[PDB]
């Protein structure tokens, strides 16, 4: 099928990104590491679709701007994490 | 005594100028043309395909002699 | 024909590689002679004939000397970091404009920005891999350098780019045919050299090495093999960045001989400055980039956005 | 997408004498060539834009190539030496085949064509 | 005053903003000048542009000298 | 590209050979428990280098991520100046650089650009 | 909008973010608005005086980031196969979009994060989360037309939303489970129309807008505090708590009218079986509301006696009393409303 | 394309985000189809736009043609692996580079 | 051809990335992949302009998280997994074998490279990125860029407020 010969690989890569975002690693940063991994794969598919259009790749910039802000915001929340808990370990948070 | 510096500067000046003056030499010896075609624009690339097809060598030029001189009409 | 074309491209890169690798050896001698003359010293004068074979006389030692296997270092990372430091130094040369084509490189100006940023990881990984207090301080002193110069670097490149119309470096030649952009861009030339120093981590911005603050910076735990490549990779950066100043502000007549008389002179300037200024303070640089340079660079984008607009109406 | 009922002209019709003249040789005569075949060119290029069917502009295309081939026969008849020097220079002077370098030899040709 | 304090503390932002202010001004001249010449209609066109003699655009062909 | 990748590999091989020569050409002597000890001015080290290294430019560190992503939007300017509407291009570009300056001066005045103290 | 000029901004940018989503004529445009909304809420939500608040700022961020990420994943996939923002016949690719949106709003199967982040929010924060943040997600689900997936969420929402709430004593955590149930009614109202949903949402926000103030004005966070809470006139305290009954949708009060119009339309559309499970499960929701009214309906209590006085903010209380009055007498104004016909 | 319920002025902001109307092989194909959606409305349009949607999808998504192409290649390989072809004459004469 | 080998490597590096635990091991894996994805994207496009931008953008994020990794997760451990090295190396060669015996006219992506375009396409003879990036700064889509600007500036106000610089540095107490 068309979807299997052309769009399978990025999707299989995407789900592997999510399975990193949920696996049990001690440090919160392990979530941030896997966060921009997924974003890297989202860019890849979005770039497939935008190129089916002849001239629409400019929207890649729009996507990248929101990619950094969620990473940048994701990093700020970690900073605020440290200065109330002292450490970023997942097991240090109240389970609720 | 400021002369003693110059031997250092002469060598660096010469060595860094070897490449560009070498390829200008090699291209003439090996292409027949000093400069290689510039694939900077679609039109340049397009025509480069055209030359590579006709003569089977993009750097061998096909002057008027390739034109069929006469037509019997 | 086409099959032959790429063969020549290989030769050019190899020719450019060996020539750059040779020059950085002779640059190090030139650094010692010139820095030995600004100081009232004589400089290396005995070895061989009049000191010319000095840098080769040192390349022997740094390779007949044993590797160091630090006890607390992640050895594979510690062992590989020199490779990529040298590789990234040589690799960035493939974008240097030639009218005798070597690589097309539309968007060559960007390719500069990507490659120069990579040079920080090699310092960064080497310092952390060494697993020594000073080495780590050197690495994190180098990263903070990037946080400062990186943003202002792009903006200042953009100003030059507006003048030429494209990111292809070749166009610098055509626009600098009557005069030199140095005249139009005098403060940027002066600013650009300042950022160029940060790129190569030189006095007055010598923080990665950090000599006399850190014992030897991120190099403190390297020896014969690794340290040599770190050194050569350092001076390859100076040589290129000096050239990149010559293509932007000084004509960019790559096929003329004088261009290489100019290139060495800017290399002399880099040594000249090292023998004049004391090192900045680790924070004063980061404040300098954000408080002054970034604001300065943005101000002229308006000046050149207006000037290009005004010039566009006339032409 | 092409099916049996779609009508393509037969092979014999598409055959026609072609230039087969390299890039540098073409760029040499560009400015003098253009002033002559403009009537055919504009007629051909106009239809191709409004009407985007290659088979529809088949007739006009043959006019364009004939005019080009017609021009060079004249050049072959008179300025053969000069044109080759201009083309050779234009080819071997820069990687872009820019006109800005070969102004001198260009002058030699322009005087040949305006005297003949 | 204010002018003095900045001119003494951060002279670059004053000089830099002085040229920045120059950009807006001579950007306002050039932009107005652009539509004072009808520069949307440019005598040299990218691509091979051919009009019919009856097309409305065919009237607006900018007629220049060189 | 494909030309550049090949030379990228070829260079990497060449530079790799250089230490592979150095590793053999290097004089070889028995490694001592002290020879491979870290360097910390000749006195044994109190603290591993892998302890948490405090940070003071964290705030600038985040601002650096942002300011770059606006470099992605200024760079295309030149490329599309010949092809765009001059009012839209002129207006938008200016209110792009004023926004950046205003943001910078705002934080500079608020003292965020200064390091943690 | 309580402390500094900065809080004023984040509130507005939240409004802009939500509006961009619900006014966007394409998935990609809609997704952008969600990102705008994301960072408008976090700074409002994070306060370092509380060890709990920063934890709340986390769970929301990880959940929402994943939701928008998966949401964008499917939207790209959706128009990779159809080449349109719309799918002619709904299939799996459209289901995936629905799953993300439900998680974005904390519907039943993916609600877990939602109560578990309510421990460390101020009351004014919970209102922004409970009411406004559910606009953009639920409003996009109106575009997608999968029945069974949407239907399953309703059935689980009312069930999990009710049974879970019986065991809580923290009012903030209790209201979360209460809000999950009302969310179930929306999605049920969303497979039939939107005008009902728009009406029903407005009333739901109205009641929650009221109950939040009463806790917010008197800073109550636990059931025990209700009994210890001091009021001059036990008649007054008795009447304030009569808003819970409206939140339970009892017909003598205004809070039933919303439930009522959702049944007159679901029944009109023959969804009889759904209403049985929903309306029946609402009783359990009505239960723990009465557990709160234990502190009001009985009206002589053993209370601590180091307070004789009520200290309350005027403007909040001034607006709260007005809102409460309609919450008890708002039924006779159904004549005026002309949005149901 | 989706229809916002709100349709406040904000929709003007993001309406023209992604389109096919800028120098595309399917610019005319989509305008007809989407026009028909405007004439009949969204829900009813999905039942009257059978041709326009299929044509537009076969112009952008191109599945209909790519999925012809593999049938040709696979059927070329199937013949050879069955011995019905030969190694010497596996492929047809290639097209001229200066074409397409 | 290298496109398939790029497919193999991006898959291979993703398998291991699922198994990294040490944050720097994750970072090195991610950095390597950011190179390949950047390379791969430019294959199926009229220019590599976006690969340059993407590469530049992510490298900014690469440095910053090392600064925080070196402050938060400094003391952690690696473990060479002989299961992993064999598994990746086993499949990697296996995948590389297929790419040599693949009908790699079929595997090529249908997206039109610049050369894949016709010769008649008049719009393909302009600057490499003129048209594509054009309407990023023309009516009406320009307002989207403007909207980002506030969004980015408003973000710049969010970090300082979340961060609360004045209450100290960051240490992994
Ligand atoms: C007392 O107060 C003071 C201080 O306080 C302590 C100071 O710190 C200082 C500090 C001074 C400085 C920082 C000065 C700058 C110097 C340094 C940072 C480091 C010192 C080293 C140098 C200057 C030497 C420079 C060169 C290197 C380090 C090596 C670089 C690598 C090189 C040259 C190799 C290049 C590669 C090539 C292929 C070139 C061509 C061929 C060869 C080399 C091959 C050689 C031989 C063979 C292959 C054998 C073949 C044989 C056969 C076939 C038979 C001063 C001055 C001071 O006064
Ligand atoms: C060095 C510091 C010098 C002393 C403080 C600045 C004196 C010069 C006054 C310039 C105008 C006010 C700037 C300011 O304080 O930020 C806005 C401060 C608050 O700063 P903020 O840190 O809360 O962030 C403001 C965010 N925006 C811009 C979105 C509102 O006050 C206001 O926002 C409204 C009052 C403005 C007039 C105050 C005088
Ligand atoms: C978060 C942002 C991180 C940004 C930095 C990314 C790179 C940091 C990698 C640090 C080394 C990781 C490591 O220890 O792996 C050891 C691995 C081996 O993993 P290992 O698990 O076997 O190591 C432990 C060994 N035992 C079990 C004995 C204890 O060795 C390597 O091959 C790493 C090679 C690193 C090469 C140097 C990278 C420089 C890159 C420069 C820029 C790109 C050009
Ligand atoms: C190739 C061989 C080149 C060297 C041949 C030398 C023949 C001259 C006679 C022997 C000799 O003098 O060799 C040493 C030479 C000069 O003597 P030197 O040790 O430098 O003492 C100070 C002099 N002012 O010093 C030298 O110049 C020797 C340099 C040889 C090594 C140069 C490094 C590159 C490797 C070359 C192989
Ligand atoms: C094992 C895997 C082997 C695969 C190779 C992996 C190493 C990659 C090294 C090549 C990187 C350079 C590159 O490929 O650039 C490609 C692209 C060029 O595009 P263009 O502007 O058109 O210039 C073409 C000029 N001939 O420009 C780009 O795409 C951006 C390239 C940025 C390069 C950064 C330097 C990376 C160095 C290698 C790190 C490892
Ligand atoms: C012979 C060859 C000689 C080669 C010399 C090469 C020198 C290379 C090394 C240079 C680096 C030197 C050290 C350095 O980095 O200084 C940077 C400079 C120092 O100034 P700074 O530190 O900021 O002052 C104290 C701040 N508290 O930082 C700065 O402040 C510089 C800022 C520059 C701003 C220039 C603005 C120009 C404005 C032009 C217009 C002005 C005219 C009036 C306005 C016109 C309006 C129409
Ligand atoms: C004409 C423009 C007049 C601007 C007046 C600014 C005068 C003084 C500027 C200054 O630097 O004084 C110190 C003041 C204190 O700010 P602080 O929080 O300590 O941050 C570090 C500042 N160097 O620094 C500041 O607060 C503001 C410094 C940047 C102001 C730039 C304004 C440029 C407007 C054009
Ligand atoms: C004990 C616990 C179990 C209680 C009973 C649960 C079973 C309830 C019945 C199943 C759900 C609803 C069934 C239904 O839909 O009834 C529809 C029936 C057919 O009428 P019609 O409208 O013509 O059908 C559509 C056109 N063919 O016509 C009708 O029935 C419509 C009249 C209203 C039906 C309401 C039935 C629900 C009663 C719930 C009682 C809950 C227990 C209270 C104690």
JSON list of N, CA and C in Angstrom, two decimals, chain H residues 56-94:
[
{"chain": "H", "resi": 56, "resn": "UNK", "atom": "N", "xyz": [-9.99, 15.60, -7.13]},
{"chain": "H", "resi": 56, "resn": "UNK", "atom": "CA", "xyz": [-9.05, 16.39, -6.34]},
{"chain": "H", "resi": 56, "resn": "UNK", "atom": "C", "xyz": [-8.13, 15.49, -5.53]},
{"chain": "H", "resi": 57, "resn": "UNK", "atom": "N", "xyz": [-8.68, 14.43, -4.93]},
{"chain": "H", "resi": 57, "resn": "UNK", "atom": "CA", "xyz": [-7.84, 13.52, -4.17]},
{"chain": "H", "resi": 57, "resn": "UNK", "atom": "C", "xyz": [-6.87, 12.77, -5.07]},
{"chain": "H", "resi": 58, "resn": "UNK", "atom": "N", "xyz": [-7.31, 12.40, -6.27]},
{"chain": "H", "resi": 58, "resn": "UNK", "atom": "CA", "xyz": [-6.40, 11.77, -7.22]},
{"chain": "H", "resi": 58, "resn": "UNK", "atom": "C", "xyz": [-5.46, 12.76, -7.88]},
{"chain": "H", "resi": 59, "resn": "UNK", "atom": "N", "xyz": [-5.56, 14.04, -7.56]},
{"chain": "H", "resi": 59, "resn": "UNK", "atom": "CA", "xyz": [-4.62, 15.04, -8.04]},
{"chain": "H", "resi": 59, "resn": "UNK", "atom": "C", "xyz": [-3.55, 15.39, -7.01]},
{"chain": "H", "resi": 60, "resn": "UNK", "atom": "N", "xyz": [-3.88, 15.32, -5.73]},
{"chain": "H", "resi": 60, "resn": "UNK", "atom": "CA", "xyz": [-2.94, 15.66, -4.66]},
{"chain": "H", "resi": 60, "resn": "UNK", "atom": "C", "xyz": [-2.40, 14.38, -4.04]},
{"chain": "H", "resi": 61, "resn": "UNK", "atom": "N", "xyz": [-3.29, 13.59, -3.45]},
{"chain": "H", "resi": 61, "resn": "UNK", "atom": "CA", "xyz": [-2.86, 12.36, -2.81]},
{"chain": "H", "resi": 61, "resn": "UNK", "atom": "C", "xyz": [-2.18, 11.41, -3.77]},
{"chain": "H", "resi": 62, "resn": "UNK", "atom": "N", "xyz": [-2.63, 11.39, -5.02]},
{"chain": "H", "resi": 62, "resn": "UNK", "atom": "CA", "xyz": [-1.98, 10.66, -6.10]},
{"chain": "H", "resi": 62, "resn": "UNK", "atom": "C", "xyz": [-1.94, 9.17, -5.84]},
{"chain": "H", "resi": 63, "resn": "UNK", "atom": "N", "xyz": [-2.70, 8.68, -4.85]},
{"chain": "H", "resi": 63, "resn": "UNK", "atom": "CA", "xyz": [-2.68, 7.26, -4.55]},
{"chain": "H", "resi": 63, "resn": "UNK", "atom": "C", "xyz": [-3.10, 6.44, -5.75]},
{"chain": "H", "resi": 64, "resn": "UNK", "atom": "N", "xyz": [-4.01, 6.98, -6.55]},
{"chain": "H", "resi": 64, "resn": "UNK", "atom": "CA", "xyz": [-4.60, 6.21, -7.63]},
{"chain": "H", "resi": 64, "resn": "UNK", "atom": "C", "xyz": [-3.56, 5.88, -8.69]},
{"chain": "H", "resi": 65, "resn": "UNK", "atom": "N", "xyz": [-2.56, 6.75, -8.86]},
{"chain": "H", "resi": 65, "resn": "UNK", "atom": "CA", "xyz": [-1.53, 6.57, -9.87]},
{"chain": "H", "resi": 65, "resn": "UNK", "atom": "C", "xyz": [-0.32, 5.83, -9.32]},
{"chain": "H", "resi": 66, "resn": "UNK", "atom": "N", "xyz": [0.18, 6.24, -8.16]},
{"chain": "H", "resi": 66, "resn": "UNK", "atom": "CA", "xyz": [1.26, 5.49, -7.52]},
{"chain": "H", "resi": 66, "resn": "UNK", "atom": "C", "xyz": [0.89, 4.03, -7.37]},
{"chain": "H", "resi": 67, "resn": "UNK", "atom": "N", "xyz": [-0.38, 3.76, -7.13]},
{"chain": "H", "resi": 67, "resn": "UNK", "atom": "CA", "xyz": [-0.85, 2.40, -6.93]},
{"chain": "H", "resi": 67, "resn": "UNK", "atom": "C", "xyz": [-1.15, 1.70, -8.25]},
{"chain": "H", "resi": 68, "resn": "UNK", "atom": "N", "xyz": [-1.13, 2.44, -9.37]},
{"chain": "H", "resi": 68, "resn": "UNK", "atom": "CA", "xyz": [-0.92, 1.83, -10.68]},
{"chain": "H", "resi": 68, "resn": "UNK", "atom": "C", "xyz": [0.53, 1.45, -10.88]},
{"chain": "H", "resi": 69, "resn": "UNK", "atom": "N", "xyz": [1.44, 2.33, -10.47]},
{"chain": "H", "resi": 69, "resn": "UNK", "atom": "CA", "xyz": [2.85, 2.16, -10.80]},
{"chain": "H", "resi": 69, "resn": "UNK", "atom": "C", "xyz": [3.41, 0.86, -10.24]},
{"chain": "H", "resi": 70, "resn": "UNK", "atom": "N", "xyz": [3.09, 0.55, -8.99]},
{"chain": "H", "resi": 70, "resn": "UNK", "atom": "CA", "xyz": [3.60, -0.68, -8.40]},
{"chain": "H", "resi": 70, "resn": "UNK", "atom": "C", "xyz": [3.06, -1.91, -9.10]},
{"chain": "H", "resi": 71, "resn": "UNK", "atom": "N", "xyz": [1.81, -1.87, -9.57]},
{"chain": "H", "resi": 71, "resn": "UNK", "atom": "CA", "xyz": [1.28, -3.00, -10.30]},
{"chain": "H", "resi": 71, "resn": "UNK", "atom": "C", "xyz": [2.11, -3.27, -11.55]},
{"chain": "H", "resi": 72, "resn": "UNK", "atom": "N", "xyz": [2.61, -2.22, -12.18]},
{"chain": "H", "resi": 72, "resn": "UNK", "atom": "CA", "xyz": [3.47, -2.41, -13.34]},
{"chain": "H", "resi": 72, "resn": "UNK", "atom": "C", "xyz": [4.82, -2.98, -12.93]},
{"chain": "H", "resi": 73, "resn": "UNK", "atom": "N", "xyz": [5.46, -2.39, -11.91]},
{"chain": "H", "resi": 73, "resn": "UNK", "atom": "CA", "xyz": [6.76, -2.88, -11.49]},
{"chain": "H", "resi": 73, "resn": "UNK", "atom": "C", "xyz": [6.66, -4.30, -10.95]},
{"chain": "H", "resi": 74, "resn": "UNK", "atom": "N", "xyz": [5.72, -4.53, -10.03]},
{"chain": "H", "resi": 74, "resn": "UNK", "atom": "CA", "xyz": [5.57, -5.87, -9.47]},
{"chain": "H", "resi": 74, "resn": "UNK", "atom": "C", "xyz": [5.29, -6.89, -10.56]},
{"chain": "H", "resi": 75, "resn": "UNK", "atom": "N", "xyz": [4.44, -6.54, -11.52]},
{"chain": "H", "resi": 75, "resn": "UNK", "atom": "CA", "xyz": [4.13, -7.45, -12.60]},
{"chain": "H", "resi": 75, "resn": "UNK", "atom": "C", "xyz": [5.30, -7.62, -13.55]},
{"chain": "H", "resi": 76, "resn": "UNK", "atom": "N", "xyz": [6.23, -6.67, -13.57]},
{"chain": "H", "resi": 76, "resn": "UNK", "atom": "CA", "xyz": [7.47, -6.88, -14.31]},
{"chain": "H", "resi": 76, "resn": "UNK", "atom": "C", "xyz": [8.38, -7.85, -13.58]},
{"chain": "H", "resi": 77, "resn": "UNK", "atom": "N", "xyz": [8.47, -7.72, -12.26]},
{"chain": "H", "resi": 77, "resn": "UNK", "atom": "CA", "xyz": [9.32, -8.63, -11.50]},
{"chain": "H", "resi": 77, "resn": "UNK", "atom": "C", "xyz": [8.72, -10.02, -11.42]},
{"chain": "H", "resi": 78, "resn": "UNK", "atom": "N", "xyz": [7.40, -10.11, -11.21]},
{"chain": "H", "resi": 78, "resn": "UNK", "atom": "CA", "xyz": [6.76, -11.42, -11.16]},
{"chain": "H", "resi": 78, "resn": "UNK", "atom": "C", "xyz": [7.04, -12.20, -12.43]},
{"chain": "H", "resi": 79, "resn": "UNK", "atom": "N", "xyz": [6.97, -11.55, -13.58]},
{"chain": "H", "resi": 79, "resn": "UNK", "atom": "CA", "xyz": [7.24, -12.25, -14.83]},
{"chain": "H", "resi": 79, "resn": "UNK", "atom": "C", "xyz": [8.65, -12.80, -14.85]},
{"chain": "H", "resi": 80, "resn": "UNK", "atom": "N", "xyz": [9.63, -11.99, -14.44]},
{"chain": "H", "resi": 80, "resn": "UNK", "atom": "CA", "xyz": [11.02, -12.45, -14.50]},
{"chain": "H", "resi": 80, "resn": "UNK", "atom": "C", "xyz": [11.26, -13.59, -13.53]},
{"chain": "H", "resi": 81, "resn": "UNK", "atom": "N", "xyz": [10.85, -13.43, -12.28]},
{"chain": "H", "resi": 81, "resn": "UNK", "atom": "CA", "xyz": [11.08, -14.48, -11.29]},
{"chain": "H", "resi": 81, "resn": "UNK", "atom": "C", "xyz": [10.36, -15.77, -11.67]},
{"chain": "H", "resi": 82, "resn": "UNK", "atom": "N", "xyz": [9.33, -15.69, -12.50]},
{"chain": "H", "resi": 82, "resn": "UNK", "atom": "CA", "xyz": [8.72, -16.88, -13.07]},
{"chain": "H", "resi": 82, "resn": "UNK", "atom": "C", "xyz": [9.47, -17.37, -14.30]},
{"chain": "H", "resi": 83, "resn": "UNK", "atom": "N", "xyz": [10.53, -16.69, -14.72]},
{"chain": "H", "resi": 83, "resn": "UNK", "atom": "CA", "xyz": [11.25, -17.04, -15.92]},
{"chain": "H", "resi": 83, "resn": "UNK", "atom": "C", "xyz": [10.62, -16.54, -17.20]},
{"chain": "H", "resi": 84, "resn": "UNK", "atom": "N", "xyz": [9.50, -15.82, -17.12]},
{"chain": "H", "resi": 84, "resn": "UNK", "atom": "CA", "xyz": [8.84, -15.34, -18.33]},
{"chain": "H", "resi": 84, "resn": "UNK", "atom": "C", "xyz": [9.62, -14.23, -19.02]},
{"chain": "H", "resi": 85, "resn": "UNK", "atom": "N", "xyz": [10.44, -13.49, -18.28]},
{"chain": "H", "resi": 85, "resn": "UNK", "atom": "CA", "xyz": [11.35, -12.51, -18.86]},
{"chain": "H", "resi": 85, "resn": "UNK", "atom": "C", "xyz": [12.75, -13.09, -18.91]},
{"chain": "H", "resi": 86, "resn": "UNK", "atom": "N", "xyz": [13.71, -12.26, -19.31]},
{"chain": "H", "resi": 86, "resn": "UNK", "atom": "CA", "xyz": [15.12, -12.62, -19.34]},
{"chain": "H", "resi": 86, "resn": "UNK", "atom": "C", "xyz": [15.92, -11.48, -18.73]},
{"chain": "H", "resi": 87, "resn": "UNK", "atom": "N", "xyz": [17.16, -11.80, -18.34]},
{"chain": "H", "resi": 87, "resn": "UNK", "atom": "CA", "xyz": [18.02, -10.78, -17.76]},
{"chain": "H", "resi": 87, "resn": "UNK", "atom": "C", "xyz": [18.41, -9.71, -18.76]},
{"chain": "H", "resi": 88, "resn": "UNK", "atom": "N", "xyz": [18.66, -10.10, -20.01]},
{"chain": "H", "resi": 88, "resn": "UNK", "atom": "CA", "xyz": [19.18, -9.15, -20.99]},
{"chain": "H", "resi": 88, "resn": "UNK", "atom": "C", "xyz": [18.14, -8.08, -21.34]},
{"chain": "H", "resi": 89, "resn": "UNK", "atom": "N", "xyz": [16.87, -8.45, -21.37]},
{"chain": "H", "resi": 89, "resn": "UNK", "atom": "CA", "xyz": [15.78, -7.58, -21.80]},
{"chain": "H", "resi": 89, "resn": "UNK", "atom": "C", "xyz": [14.83, -7.28, -20.66]},
{"chain": "H", "resi": 90, "resn": "UNK", "atom": "N", "xyz": [15.38, -7.05, -19.46]},
{"chain": "H", "resi": 90, "resn": "UNK", "atom": "CA", "xyz": [14.53, -6.89, -18.29]},
{"chain": "H", "resi": 90, "resn": "UNK", "atom": "C", "xyz": [13.74, -5.59, -18.36]},
{"chain": "H", "resi": 91, "resn": "UNK", "atom": "N", "xyz": [14.40, -4.48, -18.66]},
{"chain": "H", "resi": 91, "resn": "UNK", "atom": "CA", "xyz": [13.77, -3.18, -18.69]},
{"chain": "H", "resi": 91, "resn": "UNK", "atom": "C", "xyz": [13.64, -2.70, -20.13]},
{"chain": "H", "resi": 92, "resn": "UNK", "atom": "N", "xyz": [12.74, -1.75, -20.33]},
{"chain": "H", "resi": 92, "resn": "UNK", "atom": "CA", "xyz": [12.62, -1.10, -21.62]},
{"chain": "H", "resi": 92, "resn": "UNK", "atom": "C", "xyz": [13.67, 0.00, -21.74]},
{"chain": "H", "resi": 93, "resn": "UNK", "atom": "N", "xyz": [13.74, 0.59, -22.93]},
{"chain": "H", "resi": 93, "resn": "UNK", "atom": "CA", "xyz": [14.71, 1.64, -23.16]},
{"chain": "H", "resi": 93, "resn": "UNK", "atom": "C", "xyz": [14.40, 2.84, -22.26]},
{"chain": "H", "resi": 94, "resn": "UNK", "atom": "N", "xyz": [15.39, 3.43, -21.61]},
{"chain": "H", "resi": 94, "resn": "UNK", "atom": "CA", "xyz": [15.10, 4.51, -20.68]},
{"chain": "H", "resi": 94, "resn": "UNK", "atom": "C", "xyz": [14.67, 5.75, -21.43]}
]
